[PDB]
Design a protein around this ligand. Structure first.
Ligand code: ANP
Ligand code: ANP
Ligand code: NA
Ligand code: NA
Ligand code: NA
Ligand code: NA
Lengths: 578, 578
């Protein structure tokens, strides 16, 4: 997995090597201080053979050299060292989210139907952000502490063989201890982040649906439901904390026996006649070089563990399967004549549940306007959404111009089906911006046309700041008949070969309906049109009305014919002016 | 402002003092190492009064002791020190969000109409989380570095009053430099977080409205709109980084002239007779005690700056005004007879724009069923939402049972108005759980009743896992007529004195409508009922139909009467069969 994450760092290897290099060229600085203390003390006074005008000169080039270094050389090193480190990782994260976002937009209706936005976003943002330390503490700092440990161990290896061995005794345990905790922390961190992710999802879901929370003044009740999630997140976060604290003491206690099992031995050796009591003095002086980094790595360890947990979660999302895949046979196909064929189609949202659409057979020739009518929850919506291929039929096939939907390139297919869903969306943008969704690359002139078409242009002008009026988030600042008509506009703008209208009238008064009806009757003159509808009267003109019951097509025909049959269709119609 | 944030820490003062105490009792440990060293060397090896059996002996008591301390005393100190620190702040954050959530649920439709969920949540979560360092690095660590600076400084002053002035010379500049940057960083951090907040809002808004992004295969276009926001966030984050790096080098360069200017003067003073080498050398071993903490504080500084920026943003949200306030006169009032009076009401969403409802006068007696009909965007929705007081009328008054709506306690008022909005909400929960929103404290039996009432009970049983079926996020796994009927259920469950139904039929077929119509005609027998509707026929039975045009009430009357007048009402009705 590290290899994966590394794939992100790849185009930044050099900036990172550089960051490490400049990193090493830093220890050289702290050592210049104690080096300078020795120069004035033993090179101007303890020389005893210098003038009181000569030594008061060398102290003006030594107090001249130091200043130069520290006031000119160090500053740039310090700066670059940091700026680099950051500039690097920060750009890396950028890259990761650029990818995640494309990933999301490529998941299927299903995914988003069984997932919580808040939770998803937690990952894309927080978990990713968390992998930052892996780049910094992991690939840019840990090394310097190991280099320091090599140097130290090395120097010690010369001063004395067995004495350094007195040290290394600790090492194995240290490593064992790390290994013991690592895993459990990784999980605790995982479980923690997940908790956070759940409060996010909660907030998201509620903050957006407050309308309801307000209407029934259930603030107190929901405020509880929140505390549950907010608490769960504490709890988990504490478990995590407890262990980090725990493991920290552990690893260190081990790292601390280090200098002891050394000093103790270093004496029982200098006195037992094994080595110079000067060697013991020097050696023990380097103890800070060995068990210093080991102490830092304990913290570096911790941080990483958490980081791993995070990249886990990131990748886990990245590894989500796309339910609607293009497949090798991909083929941007132009739909020249709206010929739709539904052969033996059968649909199921899941393998466990029952099928919603069972055996559906229906043929729609170019230019026909087919209407779909039936009790609520019959299948209409489901059936329809199978065409733009939002879900893949379970058993059977749908063919546009003889081509099986699956053999189209997603975008191609979808781009040629103007679809007005029943639950229509608006972004917290301007009117224009919203219509432009139907065709982003459109003339401010063409938009105003679509508008006038969907019977929108007019009310758009009365809006403060007209076509540039910013509608509310979710498009709240408009009526029902308004939001809807903007969705309809999008259709004219798209001006596709196939038009599917799932109750595209829902919120319009009788009049406005009349207008859009006319408008549509025109645009729907020579295009393959599918209409789901409950208000029958706006379907009479249909070339063929399809009655759908309990996932089946029960009746088929012209309003005239269906009415004669005095069957299912008639029943429903008959309920209007009766 | 610090005082504010501190108010959160208050109930944790002791745990914090404790964390600081145990914090101090830590430096005592690192010093035990060099003491065991000096004690071994200058104490047992060179005592010149030790039997080879005594020095070894006294050596051992020094080790047996060391192990005890480090393997028994230190561990607990280490643990507690951390666990405390964390347990504290983590609980503090918890508290802060507990408050923020209540804050949100108390903001008005307006707030949420001009704000972006994602952005809000960024604050509640990220910005708050960011204030964590203020507790840790601020109130628990900074001190220890100052204590260390006092201790250090004291020793210098008794060692030479005029050389400590060679050291302290730096101090003022150090402080000046900090002051110079602080502010700019605080902003950069602010601006950065805001950027993050904007990508959040983007993600939220899109990830939830992908349905549309998919339908028009505008993935490429939106993926761009994302990169803009994702980039903006980089940029800003880099600006921030650059400065931190910058300021870091700065402050340190200053902190580095420190040990030098002590040597620059101190050495010159040894010469002229200030004092000798025995002092210049001793006043230099402690240099690490002074310019060590000063170096750490540079980092502590940085971290804080960021923290402040964060609490700024948190508070800024906390300081948001509630548009609908209760006011001293608050009074949980029981509405015994649904008497609604709309006297000269006039509404405007903003002071700049034009009024939507102008001069409306209408009286509704208990048990009357008033219908509201008119072109789309006329005012109906707006008018209606004024009653549950979702927005305060601009000029005029609405009175229920003679009591002015404003004199009710929000919850009281709203709890007594069963409101079925046109754009109905569902949470990613189970069917039951959703209906329970109408009355959380309800009998699994009463729910099933509401259900059967809204004509839902039936389809709920055919659902895999019946009343326990988990509907999709936003309630996606149900038809239109389905989601809606669940909203209607909520009403029966609430069983309020006043019922407002804003197109509560929108997505139902003719039949299902018939059923709920009957169901309602019953529940609406003796209650004050207000109905907004476009499908006229389901309004005929109204006691009084109100025609609303361009924010005005144009016609008033019984379907019978209105039809005779051959005016505005008739026109609209007349378009049904025509
Ligand atoms: N949050 C808002 N800010 C500004 N204007 C708003 C806001 N919310 C709604 N509006 C106004 O909504 C207005 C009229 O709404 P309105 O006529 O009450 O909806 P309606 O006719 O009942 N909806 P419908 O029954 O679907 O046709 C427009 O002229 C908008 O400016
Ligand atoms: N994500 C899902 N998982 C399982 N079932 C689903 C899901 N989404 C929708 N359904 C099914 O929705 C079904 C029938 O939907 P359907 O009849 O197409 O809506 P419809 O009749 O067109 N809506 P409407 O025009 O408002 O009456 C139910 O029996 C559900 O089980
Ligand atoms: Na047609
Ligand atoms: Na009534
Ligand atoms: Na409305
Ligand atoms: Na539907």
């Amino acid at each position: 997995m590290i290899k994966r994450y590394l794939q992100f760092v790849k185009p930044y290897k050099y900036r990172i090597f550089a960051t490490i290099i400049v990193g090493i060229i830093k220890f050289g600085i702290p050592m210049l201080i104690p080096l300078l203390i020795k120069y004035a003390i033993d090179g101007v006074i303890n020389n005893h053979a210098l003038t009181t005008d000569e030594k008061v000169h060398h102290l003006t080039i030594a107090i001249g050299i130091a200043l130069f270094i520290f006031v000119i050389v160090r500053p740039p090193i310090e700066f670059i060292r940091q700026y680099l480190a950051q500039w690097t990782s920060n750009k890396i994260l950028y890259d990761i989210r650029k990818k995640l976002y494309n990933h999301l937009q490529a998941l299927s209706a299903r995914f988003y139907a069984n997932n919580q936005v808040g939770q998803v976003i937690s990952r894309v943002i927080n978990d990713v952000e968390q992998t930052k330390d892996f780049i910094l503490t992991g690939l840019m700092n840990i090394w310097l502490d190991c280099i320091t440990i090599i140097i130290a161990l090395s120097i010690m290896f010369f001063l004395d063989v067995k004495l350094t061995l007195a040290a290394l005794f600790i090492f194995p345990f240290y490593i064992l201890t790390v290994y013991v905790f690592f895993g459990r922390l990784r999980k605790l961190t995982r479980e923690r982040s997940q908790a956070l992710a759940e409060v996010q999802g909660f907030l998201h879901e509620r903050v957006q649906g407050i309308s309801v929370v307000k209407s029934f003044a259930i603030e107190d009740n929901e405020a509880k439901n929140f505390d549950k999630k907010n608490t769960n997140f504490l709890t988990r976060a504490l478990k995590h904390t407890r262990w980090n604290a725990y493991s920290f003491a552990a690893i260190n206690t081990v790292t601390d026996i280090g200098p002891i099992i050394v000093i103790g031995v270093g004496a029982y050796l200098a006195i037992s006649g094994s080595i110079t009591v000067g060697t013991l003095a020097a050696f023990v002086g380097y103890l800070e070089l060995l068990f210093g980094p080991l102490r830092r790595l304990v913290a570096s360890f911790t941080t990483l563990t958490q980081s791993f947990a995070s990249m886990d979660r990131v990748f886990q999302l990245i590894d989500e399967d796309y339910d609607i895949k293009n497949g090798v046979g991909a083929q941007p196909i132009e739909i020249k004549q709206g010929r739709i064929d539904i052969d033996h189609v059968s649909f199921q949202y899941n393998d466990n549940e029952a099928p919603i659409l069972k055996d559906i057979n229906l043929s729609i020739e170019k230019g026909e306007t087919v209407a779909f009518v039936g009790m609520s929850g019959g299948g209409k919506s489901t059936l329809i959404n199978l065409i733009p291929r939002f879900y893949d039929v379970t058993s059977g096939q749908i063919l546009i111009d003889g081509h099986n939907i699956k053999d189209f390139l997603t975008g191609s297919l979808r781009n040629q089906i103007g679809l007005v869903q029943q639950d229509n969306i608006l972004f917290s943008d301007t009117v224009k911006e919203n219509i432009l969704l139907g065709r982003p690359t459109a003339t401010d002139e063409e938009v105003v046309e679509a508008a006038k078409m969907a019977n929108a242009h007019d009310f758009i002008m009365n809006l403060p700041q007209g076509y540039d009026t910013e509608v509310g988030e979710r498009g709240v600042k408009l009526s029902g008949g308004q939001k809807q008509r903007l969705s309809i506009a999008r259709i004219f703008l798209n001006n596709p070969p196939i038009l599917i209208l799932d109750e595209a009238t829902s919120a319009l008064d009788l009049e406005s309906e009349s207008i859009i009806q006319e408008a549509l009757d025109v645009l729907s003159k020579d295009r393959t049109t599918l209409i789901v509808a409950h208000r029958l009267s706006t379907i009479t003109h249909a070339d063929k009305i399809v009655v759908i019951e309990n996932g089946h097509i029960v009746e088929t025909g012209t309003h005239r014919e269906l009415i004669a049959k005095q069957g299912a269709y008639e029943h429903l119609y008959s309920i209007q002016n009766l």
